[PDB]
Amino acid sequence: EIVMTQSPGTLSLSPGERATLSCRASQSISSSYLAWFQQKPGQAPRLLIYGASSRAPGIPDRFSGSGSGTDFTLTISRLEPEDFAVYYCQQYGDSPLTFGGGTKVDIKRTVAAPSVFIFPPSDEQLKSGTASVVCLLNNFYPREAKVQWKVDNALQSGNSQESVTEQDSKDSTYSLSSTLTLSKADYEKHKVYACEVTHQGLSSPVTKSFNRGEC
Amino acid sequence: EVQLQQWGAGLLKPSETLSLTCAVYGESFSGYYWSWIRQSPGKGLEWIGQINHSGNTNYNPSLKSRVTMSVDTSKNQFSLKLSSVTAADTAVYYCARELGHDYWGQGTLVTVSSASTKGPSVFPLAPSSKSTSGGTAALGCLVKDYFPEPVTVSWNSGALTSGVHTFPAVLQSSGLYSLSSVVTVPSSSLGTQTYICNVNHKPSNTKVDKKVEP
Amino acid sequence: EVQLQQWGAGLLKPSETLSLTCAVYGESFSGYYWSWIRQSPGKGLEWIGQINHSGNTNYNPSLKSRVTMSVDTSKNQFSLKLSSVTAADTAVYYCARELGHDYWGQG
Amino acid sequence: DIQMTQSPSSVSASVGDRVTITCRASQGISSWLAWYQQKPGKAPKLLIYAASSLQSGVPSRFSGSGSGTDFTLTISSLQPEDFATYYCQQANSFPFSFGPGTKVDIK
Amino acid sequence: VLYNSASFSTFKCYGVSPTKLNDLCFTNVYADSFVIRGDEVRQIAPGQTGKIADYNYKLPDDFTGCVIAWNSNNLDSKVGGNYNYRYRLFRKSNLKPFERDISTEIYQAGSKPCNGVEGFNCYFPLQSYGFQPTNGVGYQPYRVVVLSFELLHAPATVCGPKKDCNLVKNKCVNFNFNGLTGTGVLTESNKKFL
Amino acid sequence: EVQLVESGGGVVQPGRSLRLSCAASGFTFSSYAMHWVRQAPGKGLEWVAVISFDGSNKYYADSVKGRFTISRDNSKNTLYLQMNSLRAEDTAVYYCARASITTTDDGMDVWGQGTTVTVSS
């Protein structure tokens, strides 16, 4: 069981720019038996490079691979629009076939700023017994986005979950929504609710809280 | 150029068995090895096993005691039998050639969870004065509990399709998914035109349209 | 505060074997008896049997020759297997504690 | 125990000449034989290993061959550095036996 | 001398017990020797599944013999890698028990045939182990010698050593002279046997 | 530059014991197998002994078996060759070499310079 590892978790380069990938393995491959797969979303993986150096039939010459031993690199000369997907690497020189962890490539643009929106729990769901507090960000390019929920000027963690949408096909940005679950008495007695955002869009972090009892 | 079409139960419950079948059309079916490859979220692609026309099987050492393939040479089909599926088996299963180089399958999503079908509940979300920064705000209704994955949330029966972001479903600890969808509209347009977040849960046949305004 | 969850085959054919499973979450599972209670229209609530983590079982004398139960301590699960179901076994099946005084299932 | 017997006790040649030196094995050694260059007053340097290869550092002018009981080295570009003693060592069994040697004179 | 040795790591025996190994006469004994990596040593057994037990070396279910394996990292390890111990990675069917398959024909993994030339979906079945001194346990070489005991209708050629004791004369003692069992007094005589 | 340094040899009365040291530099002494080669004056190269990389598997030649003893110290990067029952026919120069395999599949790629041992009256 040769554990297969890929170093760049999320490569982000502008269209028409050369991209390089890494597939550092845990052992030495038998006869450079390592391949590169491409998986467009919603489809099955497809070969691009076999034998770590040669191109599969029907593959454009824009794909090139190299490396031997325990280090393998995949090079894309030009980033065409139909090239932004996840890339997997596979080995043969061992009894169990092992795939890489998978790395994705996306289109690069300017850094945007998250538009923070805050919402209070509704009366109907308060009657139901669940106090959900959500804060959202809209149209921010960098993937990194942290939500630090503070309750009554204290620190609380582990009681929230985050959801991220897939990149917009028009402005190439992201929207993030984080949900904070609460109990009945805990929401009833707590006063101040806010989530903290750290991002590279603004040097100074911005906070927008609310209070229950007035709107 | 073979065609690999597969079918199987897309929903399961714990301590049950998983049965999948892949059908080979076109070129010869004998003299080859047919593989099953699983792609799970978070983890990566995993190779489950192989089988040929004579019943010779290769197994992944991790999934060795629970995996069993069978072959039907008469109708050119091979099958996978995964026993005692737990919540960690939720993934997408592919059938391909021996190494998955030439031709693959289509992708059969299989989800394992011990939860009965439940109708979604829509909770309106009023746009706060703090949210309304003059003319920019966000509406939406938070769907809380629904077991089956498929669900669609649309605004104004498709009239409002601009600025709508549909967040991916979140699997709650209870076994029920949760979805949230919001729309960015001008405050003047919000006042002049009312907006409804239509939902259509196919498994539960619930069509609840709720309008929320300041 | 346990959260019992149930699953099993809804539709069945005569002369088959009913099989239900109830999963236990929350607090401790061992050192307790887990009951199966059947509610049918026309009749009332009926008690089927009990089982503990050690495999000891209590059965209702009426439904004694057709009831078999098993407990899976590894995954905190106990199951019921009603054998040779007829048309009169159409009902709603619950899983609860030993007496059904504290916490019930969903049906 | 396998002893190495090089038939040429010594060879007479000048610069840029072709000579062949053979080594013979009592038993069957597949390919585990190596050659060495021993300039008197210095340490022996390997120039053929596995009976057919080129050591990293020597020019591609020592061409070894042979398999089994006979092994021959062929050189076609003899240089002033080719006047020394050559040994053949087998590696089939743990007792490793070198060859008698072969002196190369100037004529 | 084999059972009492300590360097052997695994000495599991299947058809016979190691205690009575000496007191059993067999027609023939086969010693099969090969080197495999550490993780694969578990597949050298009757009824086991793996690449090394399906494509390289397969033991029959009715196995009357022993398996002996000892670590040999010191004996077989090169700084760059041994690259000399090879295993059959690809084959189109499982081996028959006690069968050796030595072929270099290219494994056709695709629709397009290849006439002995490597390429796309055409791969060399034989692949080489990578043995290096820095390798941790489990990926280190193990030398395996599998002894198979055979019992045919031919006379038992191989028997265990027949230990004996000293000779006492002029005393009523039980004797076993090469199979002659009896009781009596043994005294030197002048009979002239042929 | 990879080099091998050897010392510890000299004129010793017969019947005593001589211990020689072959220091290592430029490589990992804990990953190679070392060899000892001796050459009497006006004679050919004679193999002496071999030690594995981990220093737990050693073989001697067919002449100095039992008498000679070989050892190593990976921490000190040196070779410990101890001679017992030294005899007057061991008058030779001793070479320490380096091999990748303890069986020398492709070894003997680097040699040192050698030290001369002359035993006499």
Author numbering:
A (entry chain J): 1 to 215
B (entry chain K): 1 to 214
C (entry chain L), D (entry chain I): 1 to 107
E (entry chain B): 350 to 543
F (entry chain H): 1 to 121
What does the published report state?
Here, we report the isolation and analysis of two anti-RBD neutralizing antibodies BA7208 and BA7125 from mice engineered to produce human antibodies. While BA7125 showed broadly neutralizing activity against all variants except the Omicron sublineages, BA7208 was potently neutralizing against all tested SARS-CoV-2 variants (including Omicron BA.1–BA.5) except Mu. By combining BA7208 and BA7125 through the knobs-into-holes technology, we generated a biparatopic antibody BA7208/7125 that was able to neutralize all tested circulating SARS-CoV-2 variants. Cryo-electron microscopy structure of these broad-spectrum antibodies in complex with trimeric Delta and Omicron spike indicated that the contact residues are highly conserved and had minimal interactions with mutational residues in RBD of current variants.
